[PDB]
């Protein structure tokens, strides 16, 4: 019993000096349950509740850096038996970039030959006596608890699961399939994402865990456009929700997002999508594939009220410095509204 209480108070101290909250908060709930139900240790219970309240406050106030995630696979007979022909997904530290991580890993294995390709190696590299190391970045896949299903969970909480409690990992593979037009670069957009499955959640007992099953997919240009529109809509909604719940927040992210949405001057994606899908040429290309452009139309149509809300908040933060920027934003907002209403023929 004394050992149990000493270990529990050591857990309390480490959580105090550990900045981890979610598991700490769950264990604090359990410890409060044990306190009230079995031992009636009221002072320790009160201190535990105070620390849990501090964790709750820090969740909303303190900033959590998002750890990066890199996939490293060691090939060749020169690596030890626990590194041979295996791939591990490494959890990067605070702001740790792939270049520094690769340099530090190569420092451990000077004999390692840095692989310059992400294509899986053949039998020759794996069976070669040398040391071959391949390091690249992968994107974690967020897994929310069933308790949070269908609920407006705060973004400060969702960002935790976006980089923690993750098993799956994805990466983007650009493939060229189509005419090489000098201007329209999106005419050859094909994506075959790499599916990575892990049996254990990150974080866990180890920073890195091996992959269990790997799968491949295929993304048509219509699907790629749908996914890009969904991602942009989610980003805009997240920014709007973050600023609507914040007061001393700069308008620079708003300015950047609105400038990106309004005028893609370097490469206009709206006109590229128009030429790629709205033209009858694509209908000849995709006779029976027409419902996807409907999804694109509804996605931009649902983007429109979000853009209106962004205009509202920008005008709320409007000043003399942002006067011409916001004037252009409003002018192009009206122009795009009229475009989507009349020229595109979509229904909002």
């Amino acid at each position: 019993q004394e050992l149990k209480e000493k270990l529990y108070q050591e857990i309390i101290s480490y959580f105090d000096k550990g900045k981890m909250w979610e598991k700490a908060i769950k264990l604090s709930k359990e410890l409060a349950e044990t306190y009230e139900s079995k031992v009636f240790d009221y002072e320790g219970l009160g201190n535990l509740l105070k620390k849990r309240a501090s964790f709750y406050e820090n969740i909303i106030k303190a900033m959590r850096p998002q750890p990066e995630y890199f996939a490293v696979g060691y090939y060749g007979q020169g690596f030890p038996s626990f590194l041979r022909n295996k791939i591990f997904i490494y959890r990067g530290k605070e702001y740790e970039r792939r270049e520094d991580f690769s340099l530090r890993l190569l420092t451990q294995f000077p004999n390692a030959e840095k692989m310059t390709s992400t294509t899986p190696p053949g039998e020759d590299i794996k069976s070669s006596p040398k040391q071959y190391m391949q390091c690249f970045t992968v994107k974690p896949v967020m897994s929310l608890p069933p308790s949070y299903k269908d609920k407006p969970v705060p973004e400060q909480i969702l960002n935790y699961y976006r980089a923690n409690e993750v098993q799956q990992f994805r990466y983007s593979r650009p493939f060229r399939k189509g005419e090489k037009d000098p201007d329209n670069e999106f005419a050859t957009m094909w994506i075959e994402r790499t599916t990575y499955t892990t049996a254990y959640t990150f974080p866990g007992i180890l920073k890195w865990f091996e992959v269990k099953q790997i799968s491949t997919e295929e993304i048509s240009p219509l699907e790629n456009a749908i996914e890009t529109m969904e991602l942009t809509n989610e980003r805009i909604s997240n920014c709007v929700q973050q600023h609507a719940w914040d007061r001393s927040l700069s308008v620079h992210p708003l300015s950047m997002l609105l400038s990106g949405i309004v005028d893609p001057a370097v490469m206009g994606g709206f006109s590229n999508y128009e030429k790629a899908f709205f033209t009858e040429k694509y209908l000849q290309e995709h006779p029976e594939d027409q419902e996807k452009v409907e999804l694109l139309k509804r996605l931009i149509a649902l983007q429109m009220p979000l853009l209106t809300e962004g205009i509202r908040i920008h005008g709320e933060k409007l000043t003399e410095q942002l006067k011409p920027l916001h004037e252009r934003l409003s002018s192009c907002f009206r122009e795009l509204k009229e475009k989507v209403e009349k020229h595109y023929g979509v229904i909002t």
Binding site: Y95, R173, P174, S250, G260, G269, Q321
Partner: protein, 177 residues
């Protein structure tokens, strides 16, 4: 929290947009996804404290020149970009981009970077340029230009191998620091 504002300018024959989108995406070289929108903002730091990094995607078209002068005021830093293997980019910088950007904000530290560092030593590219009476700009010319403009540090990055691009962005972030 703190944010970083930086204006990146260049010509369309060098396509710094691909380099910028590859850096923001952090994807493996040769596997970048061009995106429809411009103005790639991100939250990436190097040293000191986490900060927000802003990269204003400026079009190289001459028609949008009336839209650029208002972005310069109230900006932390500016990034002038040129290519070491493109004499046309050097001429454009020396004629229009360097004088006007310097004139707009005379009091601001400036960073000069070189694009396509890999093709600077490429034998086939140099042969084609010499056939097209083009001379790859080397280190001494960039150093002389940097000393003329009083830049904090002249840099040379690349896109196919990303050589020094991360160092370039670290220097850009630490210029204010």
């Amino acid at each position: 929290m703190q944010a970083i504002k930086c204006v990146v300018v260049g010509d369309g024959a060098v396509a710094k947009t691909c380099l910028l989108i590859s850096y923001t995406t952090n994807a493996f070289p040769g596997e970048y996804i061009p995106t429809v929108f411009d103005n790639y903002s991100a939250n990436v730091m190097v040293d000191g404290k986490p900060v927000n990094l802003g990269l204003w995607d400026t079009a190289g078209q001459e028609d949008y020149d009336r839209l650029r002068p208002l972005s310069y005021p109230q900006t932390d830093v500016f990034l002038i970009c040129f290519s070491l293997v493109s004499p046309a980019s050097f001429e454009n910088v020396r004629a229009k981009w360097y004088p006007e950007v310097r004139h707009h904000c005379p009091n601001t530290p400036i960073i000069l970077v070189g694009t396509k560092l890999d093709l600077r030593d490429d034998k086939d590219t140099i042969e084609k340029l010499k056939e097209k009476k083009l001379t790859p700009i080397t280190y001494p010319q960039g150093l002389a230009m940097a000393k003329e403009i009083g830049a904090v540090k002249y840099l040379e990055c690349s896109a196919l191998t990303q050589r020094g691009l991360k160092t370039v962005f670290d220097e850009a972030i630490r210029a204010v620091l």
